[PDB]
Amino acid sequence: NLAPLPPHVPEHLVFDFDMYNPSNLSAGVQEAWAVLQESNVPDLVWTRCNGGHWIATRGQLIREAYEDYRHFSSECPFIPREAGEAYDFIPTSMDPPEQRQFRALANQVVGMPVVDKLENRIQELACSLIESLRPQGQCNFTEDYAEPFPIRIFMLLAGLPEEDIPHLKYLTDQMTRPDGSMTFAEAKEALYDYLIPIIEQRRQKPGTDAISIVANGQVNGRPITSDEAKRMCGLLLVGGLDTVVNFLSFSMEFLAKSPEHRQELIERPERIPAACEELLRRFSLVADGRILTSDYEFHGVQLKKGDQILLPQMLSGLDERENACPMHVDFSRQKVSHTTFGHGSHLCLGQHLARREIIVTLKEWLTRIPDFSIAPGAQIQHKSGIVSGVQALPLVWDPATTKAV
Ligand code: HEM
Numbered sequence: 001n002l003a004p005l006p007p008h009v010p011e012h013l014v015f016d017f018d019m020y021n022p023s024n025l026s027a028g029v030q031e032a033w034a035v036l037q038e039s040n041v042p043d044l045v046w047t048r049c050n051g052g053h054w055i056a057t058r059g060q061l062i063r064e065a066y067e068d069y070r071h072f073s074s075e076c077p078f079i080p081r082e083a084g085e086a087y088d089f090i091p092t093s094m095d096p097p098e099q100r101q102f103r104a105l106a107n108q109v110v111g112m113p114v115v116d117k118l119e120n121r122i123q124e125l126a127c128s129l130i131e132s133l134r135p136q137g138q139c140n141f142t143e144d145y146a147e148p149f150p151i152r153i154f155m156l157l158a159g160l161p162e163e164d165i166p167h168l169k170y171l172t173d174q175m176t177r178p179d180g181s182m183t184f185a186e187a188k189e190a191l192y193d194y195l196i197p198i199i200e201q202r203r204q205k206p207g208t209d210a211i212s213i214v215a216n217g218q219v220n221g222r223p224i225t226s227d228e229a230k231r232m233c234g235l236l237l238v239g240g241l242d243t244v245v246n247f248l249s250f251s252m253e254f255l256a257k258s259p260e261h262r263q264e265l266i267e268r269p270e271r272i273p274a275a276c277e278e279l280l281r282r283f284s285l286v287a288d289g290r291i292l293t294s295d296y297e298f299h300g301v302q303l304k305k306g307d308q309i310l311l312p313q314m315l316s317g318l319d320e321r322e323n324a325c326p327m328h329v330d331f332s333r334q335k336v337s338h339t340t341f342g343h344g345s346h347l348c349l350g351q352h353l354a355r356r357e358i359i360v361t362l363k364e365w366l367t368r369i370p371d372f373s374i375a376p377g378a379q380i381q382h383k384s385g386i387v388s389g390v391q392a393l394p395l396v397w398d399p400a401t402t403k404a405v
């Protein structure tokens with residue numbers, strides 16, 4: 001289903017890429033998206049899929065667009081347009097200077113100091129989850145660790161019941177990797193139906209949880225409104241439940257296939273941080289965009305007001321002009337360049353939390369289960385969207401080779 005080409009779009013700039021169902025998905029999602037960086041593809045193209053929109057395919061252009069909020073606004077960040085229009089999360093759907101005030105508040109609940117205080121809890125949970133799996137000799141990583149570990153940590157930070165995870169997770173996934181079950185607007189309504197009552201209670205009887213902190217926060221000297229708190233908490237929910245969860249699976253899938261990389265981290269622990277950055281570059285998984293506020297000529301191409309442009313954060317680090325042999329994983333890269341956590345005024349605030357969860361997982365897993373692989377006959381399948389992921393990851397290992405700690 002390709003939409004008719006708009007009058008201002010030159011035919012030689014057309015490349016019908018479907019971000020929700022790319023062609024080479026079987027080869028891996030990152031590989032599927034990297035086709036946009038082949039020599040036969042211009043730096044800026046137009047796809048007729050998903051209603052029609054532009055796509056910047058180079059790190060230089062992606063960074064430029066993200067820095068220039070004057071021309072590329074966050075008002076409508078999701079594709080298709082219907083999704084971008086229904087999108088109203090704070091502070092991502094706002095442009096500076098308005099954005100700044102809310103960003104400062106959000107930083108209060110997921111910023112560095114919060115991570116520092118939750119460190120011991122993150123470590124305890126990781127160790128507890130791994131030790132319980134260790135003797136089994138097998139697991140479905142996605143549902144046995146990748147989901148429980150980060151989500152439980154977030155539910156703890158937000159003060160929400162673990163029983164609500166299945167419900168919340170489903171709604172979250174519909175927003176980033178649309179199933180077709182429901183429209184973005186409906187998924188958002190449902191999520192808000194859940195939050196409204198909670199925020200109400202937290203306003204009257206505040207707690208120390210992130211939601212209580214957001215609901216009673218102050219912005220621009222005055223107090224935050226119920227609506228503003230609802231829209232910010234909606235964002236925190238999606239970020240906590242559908243980001244680290246998917247990234248861990250990509251990384252573990254790779255480590256399961258590369259004994260040499262596992263050994264490297266086991267023998268030279270001082271390399272884990274560097275390795276984390278490289279994995280964040282190679283397995284980048286986010287791709288959202290902006291909307292043109294007015295007619296604008298960008299790198300020789302004429303963009304029209306209202307035109308939507310996808311600026312794949314995942315492509316910057318895969319761009320060969322930024323990283324030599326981009327598909328190769330090299331923990332000793334002199335320079336790891338990427339925009340996995342974003343670029344510009346909307347740089348990810350939860351990246352400190354994410355890095356902590358990734359590093360702890362790598363260290364604690366390889367300590368107890370240094371040897372593992374993908375189950376024979378299992379076919380790992382990736383899924384594409386605003387946030388890409390792994391359908392399932394069956395792992396196997398010999399318990400006799402594990403180490404209780
Ligand atoms: C590996 C995991 C993660 C990745 C790759 C990631 C990626 C991103 C990206 C690319 C953006 C910018 C979006 C844009 O410019 O339109 C962003 C923003 C944001 N992320 Fe993360 N994120 C991750 C984890 C988290 C976590 C754990 C949270 C916490 C709930 C979170 C909260 C946020 C917030 C608050 C923003 C909005 C900042 C603003 O608009 O000023 N993220 N993230």
Ligand SMILES: CC1(C)[C@@H]2CC[C@@]1(C)C(=O)C2
Nearest residue numbers: 092238239286288386387
């Ligand atoms: C693109 C993102 C990864 C970022 C945090 C959650 C997310 C889905 C948004 O809507 C903003």
